[PDB]
Amino acid sequence: GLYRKYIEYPVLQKILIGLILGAIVGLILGHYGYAHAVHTYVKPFGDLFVRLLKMLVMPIVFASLVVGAASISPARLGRVGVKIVVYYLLTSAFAVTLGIIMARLFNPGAGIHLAVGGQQFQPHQAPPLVHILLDIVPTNPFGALANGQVLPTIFFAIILGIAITYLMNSENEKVRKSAETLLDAINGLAEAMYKIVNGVMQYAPIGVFALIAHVMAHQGVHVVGELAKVTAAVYVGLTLQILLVYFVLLKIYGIDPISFIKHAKDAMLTAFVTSSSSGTLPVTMRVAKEMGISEGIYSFTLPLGATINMDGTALYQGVATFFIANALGSHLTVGQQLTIVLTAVLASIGTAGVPGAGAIMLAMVLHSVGLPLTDPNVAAAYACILGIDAILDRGRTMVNVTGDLTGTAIVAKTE
Numbered sequence: 001g002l003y004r005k006y007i008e009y010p011v012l013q014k015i016l017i018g019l020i021l022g023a024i025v026g027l028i029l030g031h032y033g034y035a036h037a038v039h040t041y042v043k044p045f046g047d048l049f050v051r052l053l054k055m056l057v058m059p060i061v062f063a064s065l066v067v068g069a070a071s072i073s074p075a076r077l078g079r080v081g082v083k084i085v086v087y088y089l090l091t092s093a094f095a096v097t098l099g100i101i102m103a104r105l106f107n108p109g110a111g112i113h114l115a116v117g118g119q120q121f122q123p124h125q126a127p128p129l130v131h132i133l134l135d136i137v138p139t140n141p142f143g144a145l146a147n148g149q150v151l152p153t154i155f156f157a158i159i160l161g162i163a164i165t166y167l168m169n170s171e172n173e174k175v176r177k178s179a180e181t182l183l184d185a186i187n188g189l190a191e192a193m194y195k196i197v198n199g200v201m202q203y204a205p206i207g208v209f210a211l212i213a214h215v216m217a218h219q220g221v222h223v224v225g226e227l228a229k230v231t232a233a234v235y236v237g238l239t240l241q242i243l244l245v246y247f248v249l250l251k252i253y254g255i256d257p258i259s260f261i262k263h264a265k266d267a268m269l270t271a272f273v274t275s276s277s278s279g280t281l282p283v284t285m286r287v288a289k290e291m292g293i294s295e296g297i298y299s300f301t302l303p304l305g306a307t308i309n310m311d312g313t314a315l316y317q318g319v320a321t322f323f324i325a326n327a328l329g330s331h332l333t334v335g336q337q338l339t340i341v342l343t344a345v346l347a348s349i350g351t352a353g354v355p356g357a358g359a360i361m362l363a364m365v366l367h368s369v370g371l372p373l374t375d376p377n378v379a380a381a382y383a384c385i386l387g388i389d390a391i392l393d394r395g396r397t398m399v400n401v402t403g404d405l406t407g408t409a410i411v412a413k414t415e
């Protein structure tokens with residue numbers, strides 16, 4: 001009885017109730033010194049929610065790209081393929097430098113007290129540029145899928161989808177029949193994961209309550225007291241300028257920006273709370289069909305950008321890099337400035353759709369400039385931003401969904 005009424009209630013309204021209620025509970029318990037109780041009991045519910053999101057990432061990226069590539073003729077795929085990737089990279093480059101310019105302009109936040117605390121080990125070492133490019137080709141298609149390789153999975157999935165299109169045009173009857181059966185089985189898998197995503201989203205209000213309450217109990221209230229500069233800079237930076245960057249581009253091509261945000265408003269809110277771009281992928285598909293985009297375009301452009309187009313994460317890479325540098329007191333000249341821009345674009349590509357990938361992947365960007373994590377002072381500052389990661393995680397996922405959706409609208413208008 002009561003279980004049913006909990007279901008028909010709209011999902012988005014439930015999340016805001018959980019997020020707001022979680023905020024109140026965390027502050028009260030933290031003030032009375034019950035943080036230890038929250039860590040032992042409340043936290044495990046939040047941990048389960050995170051593990052559910054990581055489960056869906058790989059079965060959905062492989063299946064969606066195979067179906068997306070197989071639904072476009074090879075001639076049309078080349079034209080849309082080159083245009084979508086160039087938009088993705090250029091906005092990524094602009095996103096990194098946008099954080100760079102105002103980080104110098106805004107207060108760097110050098111003044112901070114640090115303690116050794118916990119230390120990270122084995123800092124991520126950057127291989128030579130030729131080596132990371134040759135690793136896109138999977139030496140074992142099954143091994144890359146099982147061993148948590150994302151970039152090789154995309155490379156193999158796209159080729160497999162293109163090869164199926166050639167088979168469905170073959171003269172032999174047996175070849176066509178077997179090619180259709182293979183595509184249907186993969187398509188059925190892709191549709192199944194969308195149903196599981198809806199099922200997981202029903203547990204999200206409980207999961208968001210645990211994750212949010214845990215933050216303020218330990219250190220969440222400290223954002224206003226200290227480190228207000230780093231949290232304000234990303235919010236004044238990532239949210240504001242990039243949304244109007246979308247506004248001007250749509251105006252140039254003749255599309256009204258205010259109509260775009262109204263139709264896609266639900267996409268940002270679901271990405272704001274669940275922290276996963278891949279988890280919100282089915283919602284973006286629902287938005288696209290109502291907007292009027294043809295089926296062939298967004299069926300392929302949207303899945304590809306869920307792992308490639310991540311402007312929010314790229315911006316976050318630049319601002320956090322200076323925060324580590326300012327804490328150490330070191331100074332970076334233009335030579336390190338260029339290296340940050342290049343590595344941040346590469347680093348944003350390597351991240352997956354899981355929420356917490358931003359912090360772990362950031363080791364590549366810092367190591368390129370220097371200051372390895374073996375330094376306890378570097379580790380001390382690095383281990384601190386992990387606490388405020390959850391609050392800043394929400395901003396990064398939100399804009400990435402719009403950045404993916406913005407490109408499809410621009411591209412689809414061209415044809």
Ligand SMILES: N[C@@H](CC(=O)O)C(=O)O
Pocket residue numbers: 275276277278306310313351352353354355356357358359393396397400
């Ligand atoms: N969850 C982000 C990635 C990150 O936060 O590192 C995204 O997929 O857009």
Ligand code: NA
Pocket residue numbers: 087088089090091092093095309310311403
């Ligand atoms: Na981009």
Ligand code: NA
Pocket residue numbers: 307308310347348349350351352
């Ligand atoms: Na990525």
Ligand code: NA
Pocket residue numbers: 277305306307308309310311399400401403404
């Ligand atoms: Na994205």
